[PDB]
């Protein structure tokens, strides 16, 4: 799995985001930020 982990000033991982859990987490992974502003974001490509 691809995980986006938020480090703090101490270096402890205070939060994490699972990119494959849901589209919102995938958007957080794509923008490299836990909080995303209002807008359209292209994260990945769906192909059959």
């Amino acid at each position: 799995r691809t995980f986006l982990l938020k480090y703090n000033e101490n270096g402890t991982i205070t939060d994490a985001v699972d990119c494959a859990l849901d589209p919102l987490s995938e958007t957080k992974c794509t923008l490299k930020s836990f909080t995303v502003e209002k807008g359209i974001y292209q994260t990945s490509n769906f192909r059959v």
């Binding site: 849901d22 589209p23 919102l24 995938e26 958007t27 957080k28 836990f34 909080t35 995303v36 502003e37 209002k38 807008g39 359209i40 974001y41 292209q42 994260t43 990945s44 490509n45 769906f46 192909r47 059959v48």
Partner: protein, 108 residues
């Protein structure tokens, strides 16, 4: 001729052996996935737009921009706040953009 080539060297068609039928090869449906979000601060609710994808591959709405799920299509129009494409902007509701309030001037 065994296979057909479309312009710019693309394998558009091929004649099959044992049948001699000419089969057109259409590339498998592919498209980017865009995420409609009002911002995590406002809400965690999210809509998904498959670009240039028919609503045949996994609330739903089929637009010229592709297949959009998670947002309800509403007939009445509002000013655009999030861009989707094909004249459509977006609980999350998807609507055709209103270019401006109608104002007919009483010409005389």
């Amino acid at each position: 001729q065994q296979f057909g080539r479309d312009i710019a060297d693309t394998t558009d068609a091929v004649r099959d052996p044992q049948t001699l039928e000419i089969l057109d090869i259409t590339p498998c449906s592919f498209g980017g996935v865009s995420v409609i979000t009002p911002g995590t601060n406002t809400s965690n609710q999210v809509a998904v737009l498959y670009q240039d994808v028919n609503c045949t591959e996994v609330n739903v709405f089929q637009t010229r921009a592709g297949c959009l799920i998670g947002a309800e299509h509403v007939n009445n129009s509002y000013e655009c706040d999030i861009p989707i494409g094909a004249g459509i902007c977006a609980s999350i509701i998807a609507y055709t953009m209103s270019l401006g309030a109608e104002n007919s001037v009483a010409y005389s």
